[PDB]
Amino acid sequence: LALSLTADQMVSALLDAEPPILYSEYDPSEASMMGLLTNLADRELVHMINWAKRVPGFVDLTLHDQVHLLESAWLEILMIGLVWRSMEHPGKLLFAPNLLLDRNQGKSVEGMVEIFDMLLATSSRFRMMNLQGEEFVCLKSIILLNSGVYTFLSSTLKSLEEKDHIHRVLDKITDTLIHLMAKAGLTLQQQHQRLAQLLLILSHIRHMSNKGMEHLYSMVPLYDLLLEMLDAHRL
């Protein structure tokens, strides 16, 4: 059904599915800075799952594939969200309304400053491009559907069907982006130049996620933890 949605409907649904902005939890002695960060991410994860289900076409996939996509994309989704809310805070990262950190504070945290700077640069880029909220939610949906699609275990009929569907929805979101741009008044040439610029940023977002993984790895398996939350009962 998600494939019958119009651009405007696609956009509406995504806007409607946006997760809440959470707060860091502390008494303004129980955790370090990185603890505040991981705790925050843990809580957002729960909500990310609710968002994912509301993304057109996601719930049509098997439980296995849904989990695989999220396990592959969760840090990219958190990061693009952080970059989006950091846009109006040059030099700073709004991890939470009560956890606005600047570059110097990311040094306190062993080996996080590289990622910090990359996240800052991405935020500047978004600002510089006049990234619209509508384009932002499309991008986040593309990350969710595209990040793990290239690494699906089996290659059985069911899996092939799944990949066909994922790609169809991805082409859909592509049309929605082009549509928005056409509406904003861009020329065809300007439309494809901007689509390209936007999609190229996701490559840097993937890179930042990988470096975040390492940093996190350095210091229950997420698949089972995700599965647990995605696999709900109807009681």
- Which residues are part of a known binding site for 17beta-estradiol? 44, 85, 215
When the beta carbons of 79 and 181 are compared against ligand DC8, the nearer one is 79
Sequence letter at residue 192: H
Distance in angstroms (rounded) separating the CA atoms of residues 6 and 15: 14
121 binds a copy of itself (CB under 8 A): yes
Specify the 3-state DSSP secondary structure of 83. Answer: helix
Among 175, 216, 222, 231, binds ligand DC8 (CB under 6 A): 216
Residues in Cβ contact with 141 at an 8 Å cutoff, skipping those fewer than 6 apart: 14, 55, 56, 173
Q: Which does 158 bind (CB under 5 to 8 A by kind): ligand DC8, a copy of itself, none?
A: none
Query: For the purposes of burial, counting CB atoms within 10 Å of the CB of 142, is it exposed (0-12), middle (13-18) or buried (19 or more)?
Result: buried
Among 8, 88, 175, 231, binds a copy of itself (CB under 8 A): 175
105 binds ligand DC8 (CB under 6 A): no
Site string for a copy of itself, 176-215 (x = CB under 8 A): --x---------xx-xxx-xxx-xxxxxxxxx--xx--x-
Pairing of strands 99-102, 92-96: antiparallel
Displacement of CA 207 from its chain's centroid (Å) = 13
Place of tokens 């606005």: 100
Place of tokens 């996601």: 58
When the beta carbons of 49 and 119 are compared against a copy of itself, the nearer one is 119
Among 127, 215, 225, 230, binds ligand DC8 (CB under 6 A): 215
Which residues here bind a copy of itself, judged by CB under 8 A? 117-118, 121-122, 125, 142, 146-147, 150-151, 167, 170-171, 174-175, 178, 188-189, 191-193, 195-197, 199-207, 210-211, 214
